[PDB]
Homo-oligomer: A and B are copies of this chain.
Amino acid sequence: NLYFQGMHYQPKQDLLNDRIILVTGASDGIGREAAMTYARYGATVILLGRNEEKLRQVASHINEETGRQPQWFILDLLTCTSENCQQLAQRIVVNYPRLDGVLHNAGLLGDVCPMSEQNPQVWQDVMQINVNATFMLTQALLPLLLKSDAGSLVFTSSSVGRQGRANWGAYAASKFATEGMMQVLADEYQQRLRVNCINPGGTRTAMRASAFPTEDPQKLKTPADIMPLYLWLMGDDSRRKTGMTFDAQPGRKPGI
């Protein structure tokens, strides 16, 4: 997972020209940063999220920066059905000829507390968003991704998706499930799609702060700082990489 270490990745500024990339959870944090970064490197970006107010602002900011205004679509992973996912895919089909990338960034942390105290309803929400709806949206978007010359599908993992640790409860279970889903898809789509996970590591975001209220967030890298791996997985330089889980901060030791 430390593969990307010492990569010092600085791609051409048009790395993603003519790539159409959908980013979920795009309203703030890592998802907003990824959408803006991909657009700055030339991509046609599609924003997905649940907050119309924030999505409008991200689209406007991207338009100010690139002269091209991305479309946004509302999809709330916690409540959507399979039919809702297929209906979102049909909207994309009408507007875009393919998807060259899908970055699944949407997710829910839920409770950080011992197993004996985990709330079963929160557990089920974490599983619903991180695993089930992420699966359902993937399934709906597979035909679009297969129209790419080399489609790239990326899930969000975590160090606790590789080794479970005390108090990480549903989040850990859901990120192990994500690594599993990713491996099944990579196997089914060998030589057709790239399918991988990214573990962003500790990053300056509201989710991180909720899990570690004592941590000084100024000691963490920002979403901007961890973008090189996100760019690499969408551009041509990662073309024959699939079935892998990569750390965005290979240098960093997990924990506070």
Interface on A for B, CB 8 Å cutoff?
82, 114-116, 118, 120-121, 123-124, 127, 131-132, 135-136, 138-139, 142, 160-161, 163-170, 172-188
Contacts and interface: CB of A to CB of B under 8 A. Distances in A.
B172 A174 contact: no
Chain A contact residues: over half helix, strand or loop, or mixed? helix
Contact of A184 (B131, B172, B187): B172
B120 A127 contact: no
B176 A82 contact: no
6 contacts: A115-B139, A161-B180, A164-B182, A166-B188, A173-B180, A173-B181
B187 A183 contact: no
A115 B136 contact: no
A139 B169 CA distance: 11
A173 B177 contact: yes
Given A164-B187, A174-B177, 7 more contacts: A82-B121, A115-B181, A123-B135, A131-B173, A163-B183, A164-B179, A176-B179
Residue among A82, A124, A180 with max Cβ neighbours from chain B (10 Å) = A180
